[PDB]
Write a protein that binds this ligand. Sequence first.
Ligand SMILES: [Mg+2]
Ligand SMILES: [Mg+2]
Lengths: 297, 694, 707
Amino acid sequence: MERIKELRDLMSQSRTREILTKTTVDHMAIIKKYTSGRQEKNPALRMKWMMAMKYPITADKRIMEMIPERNEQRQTLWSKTNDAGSDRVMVSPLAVTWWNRNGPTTSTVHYPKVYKTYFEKVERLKHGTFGPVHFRNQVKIRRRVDINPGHADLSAKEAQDVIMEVVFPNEVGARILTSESQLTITKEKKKELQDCKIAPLMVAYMLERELVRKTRFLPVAGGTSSVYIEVLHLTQGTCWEQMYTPGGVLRGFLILGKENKRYGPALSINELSNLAKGEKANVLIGQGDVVLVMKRK
Amino acid sequence: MDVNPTLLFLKVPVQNAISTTFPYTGDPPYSHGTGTGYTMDTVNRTHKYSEKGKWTTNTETGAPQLNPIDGPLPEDNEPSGYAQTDCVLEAMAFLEESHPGIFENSCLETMEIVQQTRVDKLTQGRQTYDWTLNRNQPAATALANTIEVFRSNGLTANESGRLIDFLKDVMDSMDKEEMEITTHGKKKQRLNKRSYLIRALTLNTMAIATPGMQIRGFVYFVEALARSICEKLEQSGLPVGGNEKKAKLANVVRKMMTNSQDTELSFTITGDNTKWNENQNPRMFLAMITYITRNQPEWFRNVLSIAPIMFSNKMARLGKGYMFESKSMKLRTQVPAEMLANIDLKYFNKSTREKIEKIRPLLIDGTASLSPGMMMGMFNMLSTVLGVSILNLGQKKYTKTTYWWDGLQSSDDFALIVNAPNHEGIQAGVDRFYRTCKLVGINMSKKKSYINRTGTFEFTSFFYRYGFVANFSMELPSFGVSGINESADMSVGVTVIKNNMINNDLGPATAQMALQLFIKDYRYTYRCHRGDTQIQTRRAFELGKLWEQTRSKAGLLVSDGGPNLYNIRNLHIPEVCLKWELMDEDYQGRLCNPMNPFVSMEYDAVATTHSWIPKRNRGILEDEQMYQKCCNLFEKFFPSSSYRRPVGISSMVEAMVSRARIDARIDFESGRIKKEEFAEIMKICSTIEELRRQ
Amino acid sequence: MEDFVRQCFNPMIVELAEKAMKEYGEDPKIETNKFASICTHLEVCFMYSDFHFIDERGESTIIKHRFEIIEGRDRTMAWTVVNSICNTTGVEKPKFLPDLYDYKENRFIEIGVTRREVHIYYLEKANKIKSEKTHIHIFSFTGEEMATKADYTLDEESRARIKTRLFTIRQEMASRGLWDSFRQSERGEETIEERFEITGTMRRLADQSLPPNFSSLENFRAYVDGFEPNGCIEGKLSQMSKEVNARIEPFLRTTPRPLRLPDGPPCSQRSKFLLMDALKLSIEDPSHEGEGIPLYDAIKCMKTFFGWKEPNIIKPHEKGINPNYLLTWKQVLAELQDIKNEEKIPRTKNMKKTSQLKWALGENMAPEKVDFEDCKDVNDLKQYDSDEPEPRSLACWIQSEFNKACELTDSSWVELDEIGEDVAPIEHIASMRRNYFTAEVSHCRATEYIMKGVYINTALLNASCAAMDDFQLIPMISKCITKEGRRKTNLYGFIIKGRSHLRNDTDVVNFVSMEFSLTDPRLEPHKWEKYCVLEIGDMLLRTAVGQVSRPMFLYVRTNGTSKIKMKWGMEMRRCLLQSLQQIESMIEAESSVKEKDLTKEFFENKSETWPIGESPKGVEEGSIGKVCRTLLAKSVFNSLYASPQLEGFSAESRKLLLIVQALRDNLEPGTFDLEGLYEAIEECLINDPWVLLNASWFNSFLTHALR
Ligand SMILES: [Mg+2]
Ligand SMILES: [Mg+2]
């Protein structure tokens, strides 16, 4: 298949083979920072020039199935061309507009669930009340203020564990797998996002914004709660202050050792549920560690 | 009637209309004031302010080096580089005495930082001088080139992933008798010990100068220590910014004026220290680092001293050179600065002639030897520490007189406030502060400095007047489209306006006008005008059809031809969520359908059909994307690597192979791939395993 | 790391390890890796010992204690315990300290946790300690383990628990960025501290980086380590001559003097297009076929004017060849007529290369690039001429330019996009301020200049991008809304763009600009030194005597532009923002003093006037709208005449303005090198008309403010 063949091609070259065999997973992120080339200068001018092109956007081959080649006015929405990396077709913004006005509708029930923080902001602003504006000399005072309140019970690393369990179940490390009990929030989010077609990376980012506490060192002259820091641009200025009130199963495993070929091919984390109470098995955990483990008895 | 805008100052005080004195909102279109001549000028000026020091010849590079430390005390008011070691050490000692435990705690914090740092930290810099290519390159490219050359020269410690091990590799490379550079079919160059040393000790001129990779990590550690020191100093203007500067200006004025008695006299100097880096000696920085790191583990002191040690033997690259032209036949040519040391002196003007004669004895293999002084932008916070120490020397317990001073220092400006019984005491205090600054090598700009009764002053483009501070240290940012896509552009525009309001003192009406200008630019760029309008564009027909079809036009995004609902109230709200309640159900479902064929500063944006990816248009490493090609193909084996930094013991290839085998087995056992595909994948995995074992 | 150690292990083990480190005088704060190693060893030993008992028959049951700990106790007490055990059970004396005692196996068990591989650690321990009758168990953080004769005393469950604990500790260290240092700090069976030495070349460089009276870095370190402050600064100050001082010179009402403006011939116009001399041919209500495309709009605008005649030179360009300019204009007219009679015109019209166009665009005039060595003997070869610029004197035309840029036009030039409805009171205040400013500036001439620059630079950039190597003809066009509300399209002239092989942002593309005008150049020839001016027709104007025919001229000049300059011109709308900000700033400042909103007082009073100009009678006051328009014109002229001299003058004269302000506040201002500041200010005054006008403005302000 494509990915294994690309891996073999990379391992054919001496230098890339050297990197792959030498670099451990721990250091992968480090070499992720060794970028080449340069960054575009004047990206705004580049985008303006691109928008004048007939087909400046990249889509996938699937767009041929539903989006027609031309609209009523005979304007060509997409053409036949590739990006030299994959079967990415070149399309126009007319295709985006045509999808928005005629594309297949779906049920957007997960969007309020996934983007809970944004809709909470919308509700807080919607039902808020304003008071007068007071002009005076402003005495700002610096403090740490919660940009994101996060879950009160969950910590930062514990929130990351929840996110990993929810979004990437078969990439959880030994700490999650060897734990004894699962958190209620984990089961709640699992049930909530059972059948969600939004990108898992976006879901992970949203869960991070919702559960992880983030704090910033800011100067304030009033309310210093999470609901008040988001409307800071609206409530304070150089010499004015605006009175506002906001309107609002896979656990209990013990690592026995490294991979043991006599116990069979390595398993996935999801298929550890079919092991008996005590049965030993090789399993891939984390980001590629094959370990022989077993259930507690 | 001749219009004279500055006559407005006859009524409005200068502080209230200071904005009218700043000509540009944005970088001006000339970017002039640099070149080889300017580099020669700064080198000559630095050597002239120290000329009464001791001359030596470096035993490792042969570079002439001037040492003004402990030189004769100045007799005039011209800039001097004769810092006294005892005076600097005494200033550090008194700063420690007035802030007991400051150096020890800073050292502990920097020790944790030094132990926990990673090599990729060096990829976060700006244009850096690559010695492997002898030219400026991006930080990541230069770091990768250096790592490749070190590997080809048998230097590997940096493979541990720790910056300290990369620095150990740099130290080891300094001992290499020969350095081999291979350029890509192949071209081999050999640098002897002296050539590599000089190359590793250069700062390239095109902050003005740029160092190479061999000093960046040491400088980073030294600046981390300086940051720790400065965070504990109330008189330091760094690293805080925004309204923190306002608060500390107010605090210094309050403490110097309110505390004073009814008969005490208070004055304030708005003082400039322009070009005071020329008289900042690396040896004095080594002295103060040595004093700071007293009673610390020897390795920590070794690193922290290695930084100034390298800066002491630094070399300056002259740059592009000169351009010659002829009128007889209209000829032109470029003369590099490398031949500038062995050329006649009739092709240049008089002033360039004098520059060349002045700098010739310092030239060593295309670089000028510059031991004294520093270049701006490297040890800013250490210089802030020195200036704050001199400010701390202004307490009554250190002056032993009736006058006393206090102020603010930020490495590019200073503000002083002197209290004394009468005018004579104010003069005496000013003289004492100036003379102590001279003792520690700090030179004050008399032309750009001025004094007046406390109540109004300036500091780092913050203008204080009777308690009201106007912040004008930053320019208005660009309010046009960023250029990622419709969703990202809208989110970034609103977020930029909001953050400028929060931090850059952007006014409400100015914020509204900026929002209007951004919306105009966005509509022009993405051809997403209101749709009810009659602007003719290739996207006009579809937008008009969508506008006629829809029932609630307020729910349409601006990219879909909807109206702009953004005001100061909702700049913090994503556009999709802002008008989610007003959207038509069918339009909302189409726009937010995850199965669409388009979707593939931290800003908040919902993933919609407008999140498309635009068309992408388009040394020491044979393949420059080698590391990216490896890191990609790992994310499609472990998607979580995109969100979380991966952790594991096994090598990348072994992890990918194990994942491939497991996935192939699982997908074959579910009737998703056939026997032939399973056999092919297993065979390829076996081939990869053999390759890794080979 | 220390935080991780404290938060990872239970407090009992933390206290045990702290006591163990204290016994050897090791500070956990500085030796963090050793602390972590001790904690891990103690945790593993306790896990090995715990959950193991001995039944009454002799077998071991998991719930007498099967194991006795010897590592987590004092060395003397540990020796006491080991001696008692050996005496009671008759076991051989261990040469070194054991970890625990196994009663069931009646032996001494040593447990070792290794950061490296297990077998190497086991071999080292066997070669070092084992000797005789000692069981050794080695664990690793990677899940491996080793034991003598492959004999493991514990059951698989406890070994699995220990392996899992070590594996998770490894994972958490890796996630926290501590595993590298922890793994690199193990050599054999000990745990060293970080090592970073200065040797070889670096040691010599360090020994060469000291004050004059030190030979080695170690000696300098010794001097600094024992240094104590003993009146060093006081003695040095008493030794320094009194000539080194900062004497304050008072700044009174009689000390400041006018800036000395440069002398010489009057300065000339250097803008890219005409400002107050511009003439536009306009079509109202652009309802013609192919609307919105500049070429056809330019054609229609040209058609509206009757009065074209034979062009001729009236003001020659002293540096150029006038016939080339005349032929370029004739060729433009001929090509326009050709496309007109062709009846089928495309979006863009590219001029045919011609001798006149080749010369006017400076094509091939660029000297060829040759190696210096191949031409080093040329007698005429010299460094690229960078002599001092020729000084120029201030001319009255720049003041007239600004005066005309400050006044109102009969039509609107800027139409801003809508924003959301205002709800918050601060939003209403902001809207009121913005709407007043926009109403005052929408019809200003400076807004017309902004739009002119934006349109022209956008067209030039697009032509350069598309027609890389074609002599594209670019009409100079602007859009307007009249009082009646009918759209109007204005044509000021044409620009012919030369070769546009623009690789970098600062390389020049040369163009030729021809611009309609109604002003005769002969009145101010010095203003038009860079122009060749032709008389291209006659225009009828309605006056008291009927239709008067006045000559209509064409200002023609060769110019050049870069990508950065075009981008700068396209961003001229920012000027509006700047002006608004300035006005807002003033209000805010005043509000801070008055503790109340002053938008109405600033805008709706219509009786407060600001000093905004000067006349023979004296200082002239203007309304708020006049101040807004003047600030907008100043911003637009700063953008149009941006130069290093302008920013130098602004920065240097800000200090003098603040000093004068302090004098006006009775704050007893004083200086140190005031003459130096005057020299710095005056060094920026050479030839730029805008900077010279600003200097004259400052002089007038000084005259009035000192009084
Ligand atoms: Mg200053
Ligand atoms: Mg200042």
